[PDB]
């Protein structure tokens, strides 16, 4: 006869986990949380800032069991990393909710490991949607909540009353490292995109529309005679970009992405910046007082991602990324005094295998390294020649 979050939590808690990390860049220990996304494969989502530069990562279930997990993907821009429990047995995954349907008045419960105390559940409400600005270079469209969140909670779950995952708790405005009623979480629709990508490739292939923009405030809207105090203001479209071909002109106000109204430029960025190259979307435009509807196809890009350090753990040097279909890892740009280039690693190389194993993309490459060989025999291709780079 007493209302309680107990029943829903009895089913959902096994899905959340605590993560222990051991790394070096100097030795360090870190701790946070993670959410089991796929029970069978043992995929566990979490903040990239928790497992970053980790030599060893161990996952601990709510029932006590400890497992070892290895990395599979990690996107610093959105701060979402995907690890995988080695030897997954009898896990429970969380079902994901559609974050686009969240409304500010909604209830929320957060689950995670504050200060290593163990699985802690605290509750509150959605205080705001679309918050961004914490770190202006990243993609951020944070859900804001007043459910208590402290250090240890990162990577943990943020669920609705029905037990569905709506976000991953990431950060907190807070002077003197102590929760104050203001916490942030990446919405779940982003986790579902960034994550599935990582599963199938090892990195996120970022697509761009090709427009330069800025937040459309009330002042700029007067100067530009537009009845709208919020939205994405198009500064200029790039030549031969998706937006160009679609018909978007500078001085345009983007007001909606796929039926959904667009809080601001930051969200629009985070939205498409989370979609995979080739996705078909439709933008809601506003040029010279008239409404407009256009169809776009996200295209390639020049996304700065996966550095030779995120896959080698310590091997400073050229950045790397997938190449076309599963054609292998490509070495983006080699620096100079960076250790990677100090082993024959030159920009333009295409790692097509390692230790007699084929490397179609970053995921597979990280698989060979997962076994931890004593000597890594890279089979790359420079121009029209096949060569071999050795390591230890």
């Amino acid at each position: 006869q007493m209302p309680s979050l107990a029943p829903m939590l009895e089913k959902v808690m096994p899905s959340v986990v605590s993560i222990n990390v051991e790394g070096s860049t100097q030795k360090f220990m870190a701790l946070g949380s993670g959410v089991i996304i796929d029970a069978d494969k043992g995929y566990v989502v979490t903040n990239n800032h928790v497992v970053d530069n980790a030599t060893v990562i161990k996952v601990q279930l709510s029932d006590g069991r400890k497992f070892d997990a290895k990395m599979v993907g990690k996107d610093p821009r959105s701060d979402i990393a995907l690890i995988q429990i080695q030897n997954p047995k009898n896990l429970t995954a969380i079902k994901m909710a559609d974050s686009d349907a969240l409304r500010v008045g909604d209830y929320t419960v957060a689950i995670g490991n504050p200060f290593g105390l163990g699985e802690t559940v605290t509750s509150g409400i959605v205080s705001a949607l679309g918050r961004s600005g914490l770190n202006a270079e990243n993609y951020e469209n944070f859900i804001q909540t007043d459910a208590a969140i402290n250090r240890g909670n990162a990577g943990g779950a943020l669920v609705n009353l029905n037990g569905e995952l709506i976000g991953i708790n990431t950060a907190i405005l807070a002077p003197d490292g102590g929760n104050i009623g203001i916490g942030f979480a990446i919405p779940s629709n982003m986790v579902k995109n960034l994550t599935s990508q990582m599963v199938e490739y090892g990195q996120v292939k970022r697509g761009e529309l090709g427009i330069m923009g800025t937040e459309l405030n009330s002042e700029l809207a007067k100067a530009m005679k537009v009845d709208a105090q919020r939205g994405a203001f198009v500064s200029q479209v790039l030549p031969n970009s998706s937006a160009a071909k679609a018909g978007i002109k500078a001085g345009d106000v983007i007001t909606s992405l796929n039926g959904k109204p667009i809080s601001s430029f930051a969200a629009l960025r985070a939205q498409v910046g989370t979609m995979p190259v080739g996705s078909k979307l439709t933008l809601g435009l506003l040029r010279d007082g008239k409404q407009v509807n256009v169809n776009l196809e996200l295209q390639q890009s020049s996304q700065n991602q996966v550095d030779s350090s995120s896959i080698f753990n310590g091997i400073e040097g050229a950045e790397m990324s997938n190449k076309g279909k599963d054609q292998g890892v490509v070495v983006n740009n080699v620096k100079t005094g960076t250790p990677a280039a100090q082993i024959g690693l030159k920009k333009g190389d295409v790692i097509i295998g390692a230790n007699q194993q084929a490397v179609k993309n970053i995921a597979e490459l990280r698989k060979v390294l997962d076994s931890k060989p004593s000597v890594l025999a890279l089979n790359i291709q420079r121009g029209d020649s096949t060569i071999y780079l050795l390591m230890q």
Copy 2:
């Protein structure tokens, strides 16, 4: 099928606003919140400590729109100031609830702008009623709540589940400027009195009963043989005061104001200190074990208010206040080295107009100043002579 504050908030949020201030006393910027009290006129309530000494104040709605607002009233003792949006178009006002019916177990949601992040809503419960003591010189009868409140929230709303305003969030007990679960808000019945007054005059005309008092604790109650551990203890009544005429004698315990029980002396003070001169009230007395009922009529006073600085913004000098009916602003007491007296401002003067505009009270006077003339031509009356004081 999920309970949520969303529906109520969809209607109420447009009513709350964020306030940006620019001032000097040295230049400064400040930010807080405000609540739209009257949609048509654009009246917006807020903490006096937010807009105080402000050269410029800008209001921003939840939809993005920005407007400029000018001051109309401000009472430092209760910490309630009333500003007005210039050119109000399509606003939503909040409906006010009767704060006297609040009970400690009640739910509350607070809306405001913590650290400029934007419209943030957080929730909790009424933790206590009648808190006072924060600043012993002011009038305080605070509602206490554990809904998260931080810097930026001042001037914001505190509403019940039905969306009705029960208070204005004002302050927070909190070491290291971070919410800790203890926040305070001026109840709404006070805002409704102090505010309506300001609208119609520019200041609050304070009425007094004319009694000296003190909190009636358990100890004093023994010494005085009174069965009551709480209430207002009458130390002495002033000669020719309302209380005197009504029949109140020293050694009396005031236990109720208009049917309503009286938490303490502080509340009693804050209660009547918020009512306008001439209001008809009835006090519940307790003299020598016997219950008593008396009828009073709040009378004049010697209220220290509106200084020549709150209307001139920087012109130190004599204090000012309305005079009788709309008879104009009266200059209370001129200091000495104060800039105001340094322009011919002498105590006893009665500003009856400014720049060829009639000044019936402080509101109108602040209207002429609102246009921001280059030279302010005061038409005051010293004794039986009409004179003119110039400014720039």
Copy 3:
């Protein structure tokens, strides 16, 4: 038509009280809360760390009334002390709930006196059960909650929606003495045992099973081939102990106490460490993969409790404790330079009376001292002789 904790709180708040203490060890003042356990006798429970080393303790009801209270019991290991209001008139006691039925999703409201502001009520949920580790020497099986708790709250109540007491708020993880969303409370079943004991004897007579243990983590469980990631691991049983006689062998995993599953060793300890000598319990064992059920009878012990300082307030010296049935207070072990031994207090003595009053146990002894004589005439027995120790 609005849901509210008000109705339940109207009945329950009178039960909680604020406590003011004056002590010395140097003079000090302290403040906290307490819960009325028995209306008739005026028994009030509270944290031992609040009233410890107190020369004077005053209790203040929610209605204003102040009373003086004297101590009756106090257990530092569990941090529960029992005081008694002198001259109890018209009090309300709280009814206790069965804490073993609490589940993590459950709602909770906390009542107490943060920073002396007065009776404050804040709410939240059960974040976790069985937390321990705060102070590794004590008995701890804390309920964890995110209802706001700050200094002043210790000794206060933690109740469920029905108004029943489920715990006593004791401490908070919190950098910079400010609530952060993590608070702890001793569950009510412990308060009900530790407390009733104190009532009937002045101290808690601690019983032990006689086993050496440790938390059974996942690692130790592999090494020991046991399908269980949590429980109490038996390191060794003591000779002629209850556990010995019952049949418990080292290398055993205790997994349940009286039907109830056992979170960990810490809980198991806190559980039985709270039961009185002679209690009949049954343990759930797990030896060599096979389940086991055994019946035990808590036995004596060597519990380090009640020091000559907790009953004399300042008289350093030999520790003391009850003796057999109501046979009087026994002086455990006298130090050397300790003031107590500096008045003829030698270990082995059996205080059998004081100032012509019989002393059956520590409660009665503290009764004679309660009247505050000028000279305390102890009638103790050394060997086969009756002697008298004088004090002032």
